[PDB]
Chain A
Amino acid sequence: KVLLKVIILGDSGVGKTSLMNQYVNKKFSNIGADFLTKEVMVDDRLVTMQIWDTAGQERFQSLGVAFYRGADCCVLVFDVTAPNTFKTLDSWRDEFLIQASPRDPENFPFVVLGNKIDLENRQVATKRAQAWCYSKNNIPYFETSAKEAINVEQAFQTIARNALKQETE
């Protein structure tokens, strides 16, 4: 029996809440998201994942320390069609380390999701996002679509494995 806390960070409008709902509830839309729980198998070991939604408090960058307490993994999401949501990835990463103070922060489990790949007017190149992800101590990068449910399940399988690593270490 193991409980993992995973938070999903990133600017408003990138798809954080949809990524969560798509993963747990396999349902996409278009109010009231808090946190979802899901039982999963990570390399044969049974774990429990607790996904925390921002309840929109990032709209004006007002997420408090309580929100980060004891996070096992931090998902950084951006919109491949909105280059500015990609440039804030560092600021969200820095913030996480500031507020969460994790053990061995230089190796903390960060997973980056380039969302909305189903949209045709992409502005951020796969290579560009991969280079940045690599430069940050080689963190995993997945391109997703909460709308068409592309790569979400697999993306969360890694998020879960990495979350369990941090929780066990």
Chain B
Amino acid sequence: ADNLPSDFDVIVIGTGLPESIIAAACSRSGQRVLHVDSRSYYGGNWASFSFSGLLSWLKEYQMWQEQILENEEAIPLSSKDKTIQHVEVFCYASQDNRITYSQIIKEGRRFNIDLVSKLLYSRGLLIDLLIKSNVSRYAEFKNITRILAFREGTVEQVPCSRADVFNSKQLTMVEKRMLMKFLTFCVEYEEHPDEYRAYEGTTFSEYLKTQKLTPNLQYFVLHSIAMTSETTSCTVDGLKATKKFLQCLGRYGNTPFLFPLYGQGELPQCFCRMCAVFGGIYCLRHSVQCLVVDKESRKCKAVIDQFGQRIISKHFIIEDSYLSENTCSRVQYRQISRAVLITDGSVLRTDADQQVSILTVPAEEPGSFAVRVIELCSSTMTCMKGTYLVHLTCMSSKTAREDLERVVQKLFTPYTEIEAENEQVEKPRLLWALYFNMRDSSDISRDCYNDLPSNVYVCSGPDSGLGNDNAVKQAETLFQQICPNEDFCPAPPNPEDIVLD
């Protein structure tokens, strides 16, 4: 044994979140799974890195014909990843309360920089899947403690939990009445189908206009509570979002969001573990050269790895980045604008340092999209003590820097050796910044890809949204095609399910 087996039921290429969930599901159902990756770490474009690991990651973006048997043809795979672009790095801190770049390097292992900036809702596809499958035992979570809004070009905490409201007076009593009344209504908008009657055909932002709501509250709801594309979302879509938001409140904290200790990057490994636990065989630093197609049936028969080994399988799951440019000549990708910052203070300073916040900045110019800002504190185990890790994300328009620096500039001020009259009133300092674009291959039809056999499935990378619903949904959909009528990631066996005398 210990020699890699030459046949499996399922072969999965890429250890991104979607891929790992589907590998877990197949393995859990009883399929012999082989899960490979070309990188030396798990995650693919869902990974997180130590500071030193990130600099190495940055770098990059700045043997089988004799195995093809009779009656077969090959579909070469990609050998070079091209999902990242426009990498821009800036180090404002000094090179060697003042955090120098040298301190960052020394404590580099205290950082866990996610390539993907998302959050978990108290209830949703991923969290519900973590609890049901028990993959949740593999992680610890932190609660988001603050919802922030950006109006008038200024930061401010938005009261959400019906309590948080009555513990503040940032709103008149005429607006508060509109609030409870409006929220209590959204919490069950489908019970009063007379409030969004004719607005069904129109968008949500449009709908909010003609409501018993000022512009202020109309703002908070539209950008901080619903958080939906105020343009690319109709009334229903908008109300449904608010309901989701509100219902998730108070389940764990004063907001509807949780963040995994050590970062989003832990999620794919959690699922990969479940796959392993149930028999999955893992191989990192293990690329596949090509797919082997049966000229007769037209089904994919096997793969040939970088070592020249033929490995047979019934189903083949491949993450988009591994397909050749030829296989992808017609695909129209979208892009994700990302920015990672290491700061020495919170966007909104307070006594209680260890806070995890999410700020929403609406698009200012046409053609651009809402920017999501997530602030992590050291106790989230993603950055060293004394700093904050801020993640900015938005669907792309132009390059990452062009799309986001504008927002970074309004919230942070580049570190300098210029002491100001009073720092406590000064904007937080930016010590180090990274900008980059990531390919968005989500919501792309299978047929957009050329000549891929029917038993070859494709996984997309991450999307630009706040949650992981796209990662779960596609996995679930895949499982339905590979294992018809089978509980998806059922809960592992338990002696307590059926209690006897």
Contacts and interface: CB of A to CB of B under 8 A. Distances in A.
Contacts of B270: 66
Contacts of B42: 64-66
A12 B266 CA distance: 24
A64 B2 contact: no
Interface stretch (B181-189, B228-236, B282-290, B402-410): B282-290
A69 B262 contact: yes
B115 to A, nearest CB: 14
B2 A12 contact: yes
Contact of A55 (B273, B283, B284, B286): B273
B453 interface: no
B4 A55 contact: no
Given A66-B270, A101-B109, A57 B276 contact: yes
Given A12-B2, A59-B2, A60-B283, A66 B138 contact: yes
A62 B273 contact: no
Interface string B193-214: 0000000000000000000000
Interface string A101-125: 1000000000000000000000000
A83 interface: no
B281 A64 contact: no
B397 interface: no
B272 A56 contact: no
Interface in A43-84: 55-57, 59-62, 64-67, 69
Interface string B28-51: 000000000000011000000010
B279 interface: yes
B278 interface: yes
B266 A66 contact: yes
Contacts of A65: 41-42, 269
A92 to B, nearest CB: 16
Which of A13, A59, A62 has the largest count of B CB atoms less than 10 A from its CB? Answer: A62
Given A66-B138, A101-B50, A56 B281 contact: yes
Interface residues of B, number: 24
A13 B2 contact: yes
Given A31-B279, A65-B41, A60 B273 contact: no
Contacts of A62: 282-284
A32 B277 contact: yes
A49 to B, nearest CB: 15
B275 to A, nearest CB: 9
B173 to A, nearest CB: 46
A126 to B, nearest CB: 27
Interface string A6-40: 00000011000000000000000001111100000
Contacts of A64: 41-42, 269, 272, 284
Nearest to B261: A69
Contacts of A66: 42, 138, 262, 266, 269-270, 273
A32 B278 contact: yes
B277 A55 contact: yes
A75 B273 CA distance: 20
A34 B280 CA distance: 13
Contacts of B138: 66
B235 to A, nearest CB: 42
B276 A55 contact: yes
B5 to A, nearest CB: 11
A60 B276 CA distance: 12
Nearest to A54: B276
Given A59-B282, A61-B284, A66-B269, 15 more contacts: A12-B2, A13-B2, A33-B277, A34-B277, A59-B2, A59-B281, A60-B284, A60-B286, A64-B272, A64-B284, A66-B42, A66-B138, A66-B270, A67-B273, A69-B262
Minimum-distance CB pairs A-B, first 5:
A101-B109, A55-B276, A66-B269, A62-B282, A62-B284
10 contacts: A34-B277, A56-B276, A56-B281, A57-B273, A57-B276, A59-B281, A64-B284, A67-B269, A67-B273, A101-B50
Interface of B: 2, 4, 41-42, 50, 109-110, 137-138, 262, 266, 269-270, 272-273, 276-279, 281-284, 286
Interface of A: 12-13, 31-35, 55-57, 59-62, 64-67, 69, 101
